[PDB]
């Protein structure tokens, strides 16, 4: 389950088009949005955000979680 191996159009990088990237745009924005879906509202709950050094912090603020959220895909 992936999208690769164009096998044509010689280029210095990969190319994904069609319904392939349309599914990747949905899967990327879904995992990013699922982060703050449990923190929405006053009844929402917080979470721990771990850095690369191994430290972490916990906050229920959605603006802080999204600022510390690492999104790999450009769609997210």
């Amino acid at each position: 389950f992936n999208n690769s191996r164009s096998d044509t159009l010689f280029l210095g990088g990969e190319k994904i088009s069609g319904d392939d990237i349309r599914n990747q745009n949905v899967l990327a924005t879904m995992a990013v949005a699922n982060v703050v879906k449990s923190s929405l509202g006053p009844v929402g709950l917080d979470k721990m955000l771990v850095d690369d050094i191994g430290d972490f912090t916990v906050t229920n603020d959605g603006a802080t979680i999204l600022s510390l959220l690492d999104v790999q895909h450009p769609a997210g």
């Binding site: 009844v43 721990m48 916990v58």
Partner: protein, 518 residues
């Protein structure tokens, strides 16, 4: 990378359970030893609860929160570090089947933990017994709990005198409905700060009322004690000043030296003349003091003490009343040496001291520790901190609670009795709190070797009929009353243990997601 859904709830339970499981056998005087193999090839066989987990590095963030919880818990109470970690870890362990297998929402459990915390603190106050904090014989038998099984057991009577005389100076006992009650606030950290002096005997350890300074007097021959001292505190050092211009002093010709030196001797004399105008017997400068300023104040009949910290001058101002002044020309007439008994240059162990001590208590004392070596001083130090920590818990509330699993089991019985009228979905996570209360007397039995099922069943049935004061003996392991063998811990140990456990339980249940990366 990312852990979401119920998987993070599993990792939060596994992390807190693994940290607790290590020290579950570290509770009690009979606690079993732990072998920790270091990555460098060494090993640590000590059973100390805090010394083990400190050398253990953990990965999961909830495991690090349990380590930081014990660090904050150690600042409140000096002992019972393993008691809080077991209780905080077992509550999440008992709520684990309800959170997953029973599919109970975490907010429902967290809301039930807030009601279980209030009910638990009320039961502790019911089973607790009053104690007289003004009785000297009663306070010594209390502090003795943090004394025995240590090298200070022989001097214990003097160890209590160092702890009691220290808390009595800092304590402020007041109450009313007007300005409020301080609840007997005592700060051991800042005001009670110990000073370790090498040499002498442990019996020679005294509680000094005042401040102590190790810096000596700038002159070898000086007055050893002052009848009526006049203290002068100031910031700006005493030295030849510099102009506001680019002026530089370079002297080549031999007859031009006395021209600048006469100006240097004159300007320093004017700075010392401003001090001597009030005829002080003592001079204390925050910064350094030039040799010329030392001579002018030498013939002026006053002692000079160079280089005193600003934080020291604030404590010097309380034992004296000297007003802090910045510029030497700004010295106020409000600067006085009143309420200062003597100034002592006394040397103990080839080390010059300074004693500003007076006959009154300015809310802060100074502990003078003596011994046979530095290793003995470090032993008395940490043992006095544990002696003052138990003394602090007794002075911050006049109540004692039975130990050895008596209070832990008594609460579990009262929580189960109240749970009968608590009907509704919050009853299920509530009963898990009482089951976690039984874990503390369970580890004491497992460390003892007796049958855990038979004893806990007879121990819980003992509270349901007999008095709540019947606990478990540490040395034996058989059900006994705490009246015969007391083991009376202060309630503050039980207070903070239950409060921080529910807060830690609500902390881990409040995090349903784990995300890594910046």
């Amino acid at each position: 990378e990312r852990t979401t859904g119920r998987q993070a709830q599993i990792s939060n339970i596994t992390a807190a359970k693994a940290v607790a499981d290590v020290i579950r056998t570290c509770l009690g005087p009979k606690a079993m030893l732990k072998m920790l193999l270091d990555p460098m090839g060494g090993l640590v066989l000590t059973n100390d609860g805090h010394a083990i987990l400190r050398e253990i590095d953990v990965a999961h963030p909830a495991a690090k929160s349990m380590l930081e919880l014990s660090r904050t818990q150690d600042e409140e109470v000096g002992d019972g570090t393993t008691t809080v970690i077991i209780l905080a870890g077992e509550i999440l362990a008992q709520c684990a089947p309800y959170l997953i297998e029973k599919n109970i929402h975490p907010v429902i459990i967290i809301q039930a933990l807030k009601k279980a915390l209030t009910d638990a603190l009320e039961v502790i106050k019911q089973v607790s017994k009053p104690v007289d904090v003004e009785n000297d014989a009663a306070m010594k038998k209390l502090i003795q709990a943090s004394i025995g099984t240590k090298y200070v057991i022989h001097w214990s009577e003097k160890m209590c005198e160092l702890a009691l005389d220290a808390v009595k100076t800092v304590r402020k006992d007041l109450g009313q409905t007007v300005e409020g009650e301080p609840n007997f606030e005592i700060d051991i950290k800042r005001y009670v700060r110990v000073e370790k002096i090498p040499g002498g005997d442990v019996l020679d350890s005294r509680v000094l009322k005042g401040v102590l300074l190790n810096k000596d007097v700038v002159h070898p021959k000086m007055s050893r004690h002052i009848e009526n001292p006049r203290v002068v505190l100031l910031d700006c050092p005493l030295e030849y000043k510099k102009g506001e211009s680019q002026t530089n002093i370079e002297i080549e010709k031999e007859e031009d030296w006395n021209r600048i030196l006469q100006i240097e001797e004159e300007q320093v004399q004017l700075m010392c003349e401003q001090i001597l105008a009030v005829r002080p017997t003592l001079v204390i400068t925050e910064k350094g003091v030039s040799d010329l300023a030392q001579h002018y104040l030498l013939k002026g009949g006053c002692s000079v003490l160079r280089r005193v910290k600003k934080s020291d001058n604030n404590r010097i101002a309380r034992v004296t009343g000297a007003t802090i002044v910045n510029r030497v020309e700004d010295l106020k007439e409000s600067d006085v040496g009143t309420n200062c008994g003597l100034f002592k240059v006394e040397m103990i162990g080839d080390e010059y001291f300074s004693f500003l001590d007076n006959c009154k208590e300015p809310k802060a004392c100074t502990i003078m520790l003596r011994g046979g070596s530095k290793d003995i001083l470090n032993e008395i130090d940490r043992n006095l901190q544990d002696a003052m920590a138990v003394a602090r818990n007794v002075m911050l509330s006049p109540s004692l609670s039975p130990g050895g699993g008596a209070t832990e089991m008594a609460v579990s019985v009262k929580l189960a009795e109240k749970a009968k009228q608590l009907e509704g979905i919050q009853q299920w996570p509530y009963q898990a709190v009482a089951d976690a209360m039984e874990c503390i007397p369970r580890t004491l039995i497992q460390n003892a070797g007796g049958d855990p099922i038979r004893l806990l069943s007879q121990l819980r049935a003992k509270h349901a009929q007999g008095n709540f004061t019947t606990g478990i003996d540490g040395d034996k392991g058989k059900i006994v009353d705490m009246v015969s063998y007391g083991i009376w811990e202060p309630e503050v140990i039980k207070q903070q243990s239950v409060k921080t456990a529910i807060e830690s339980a609500c902390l881990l249940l409040r995090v349903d997601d784990i995300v890594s990366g910046v």
